[PDB]
């Protein structure tokens, strides 16, 4: 009855694609050979978020906690709130909701409450400026991540209002057979519960690395003053590179911690962004998952998107293996017919997806 996976890798993507496809899965051996074996609290609260979003889906955790049974149900949405734990920020829970977000009965108006940022997760500016435009040109038109207040780790206390309100039928078929020309490069440097000079130090470091490329650099600056600052000191920086003729974007972020020089963090995020531009072609290394997920749940046509050589990795092909494991589809990597670079063009024939929850 159940499609069986092993191990606690790609856990959110497995539960998300099971909710999209409507197929009952089992995930077996959730870190069974470990000292505290089983599911952790942040992924258990992610399961609670899935039960909040859907309706009629039965999730069945075992005694030992090392295997989970997800029998999915209808995405209904509604208005909710999610008090996610301190182990993961709000980006860890709003990232897998952007897949399920445009395919529900009622529009997503959720506000997550917890830590805003993390080193190894998505931020508010990451989710917004990077991951909303790829949905914005995959078919949705009204999506917004609002910050009402933001909380840096460890105490956090920041709330984030994810509101999507375009309930599309299916995402359109992508056709990106080009490398998009980067028109500008902008960003946002944020700081909470610290001095307002750290933001300008971060901005000056990032722009002194960026100054030798002949484009236009613009980094916006926000210090957070008052109750909107949260319960902990923190600061961070997120740059995007913006192709304006099509709308594409390539982002890179990080946050500082106890003992971190802001010019160091600014130049680090600037060089990390330029390396993402190098290893990128029409997507980012982190915008690529939901890009090819929307290409695989588009119409029953061929949609083609250009990628480069260095975007192929163990993460990307374990994504492709999980996609084929759930709903039996392959990607076809055809190479381009010009040879100053190594770029494939991934053509995916999408499954015949519609959202059948939206009332007619």
């Amino acid at each position: 009855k159940y499609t069986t996976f092993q191990g606690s890798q790609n856990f959110r993507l497995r539960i998300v694609l099971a909710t999209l496809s409507g197929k009952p899965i089992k995930i077996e051996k959730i870190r069974s050979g470990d000292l505290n074996p089983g599911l952790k609290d942040y992924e258990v609260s992610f399961l609670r978020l899935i039960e909040s979003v859907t309706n009629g889906s039965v999730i069945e955790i075992s005694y030992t906690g090392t295997t989970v049974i997800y029998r999915p149900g209808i995405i209904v949405g509604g208005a909710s709130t999610h008090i996610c734990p301190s182990s993961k920020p709000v980006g860890y829970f709003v990232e897998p909701m952007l897949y399920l977000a445009p395919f529900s009965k009622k529009k997503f108006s959720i506000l997550f409450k917890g830590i805003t940022a993390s080193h190894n997760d998505a931020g508010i500016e990451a989710i917004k400026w990077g991951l909303m435009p790829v949905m914005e040109k995959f078919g949705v038109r009204e999506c917004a991540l609002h910050t009402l207040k933001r909380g840096s780790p460890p105490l956090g206390g920041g709330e984030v209002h994810l509101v999507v309100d375009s309930l599309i039928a299916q995402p359109i078929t992508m056709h990106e057979i080009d490398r998009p020309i980067i028109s500008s490069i902008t960003g946002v440097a944020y700081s909470t519960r610290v001095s307002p000079s750290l933001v300008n130090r971060m901005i000056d470091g990032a722009k002194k690395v960026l100054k030798n490329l002949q484009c236009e650099v613009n980094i916006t600056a926000d210090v957070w003053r008052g109750e909107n600052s949260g319960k902990s000191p923190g600061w961070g920086i997120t740059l995007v590179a913006q192709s304006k003729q099509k709308g594409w974007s390539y982002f890179a972020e990080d946050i500082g911690d106890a003992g971190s020089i802001p010019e160091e963090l600014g130049e680090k995020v600037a060089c990390q962004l330029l390396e993402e531009i190098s290893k990128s072609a029409a997507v980012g290394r982190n915008q690529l998952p939901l890009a090819i997920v929307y290409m695989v749940i588009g119409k029953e046509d061929i949609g083609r998107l250009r990628i480069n050589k260095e975007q192929i990795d163990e993460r990307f092909i374990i994504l492709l293996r999980d996609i084929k494991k759930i709903f039996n589809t392959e990607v076809f990597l055809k190479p381009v017919d010009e040879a100053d670079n190594e770029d494939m063009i991934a053509t995916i024939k999408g499954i015949g997806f519609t959202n059948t929850s939206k009332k007619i």
Binding site: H146, S197, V199, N200, D222, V223, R225
Partner: peptide, 23 residues
């Protein structure tokens, strides 16, 4: 020092933008 970075916070513009004859 960066007091102008708080003087150019979300006041009006970023406050609105950071949510998206005679005689």
């Amino acid at each position: 020092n960066g007091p102008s970075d708080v003087y150019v916070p979300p006041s009006k513009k970023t406050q609105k933008l950071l949510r998206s004859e005679n005689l």
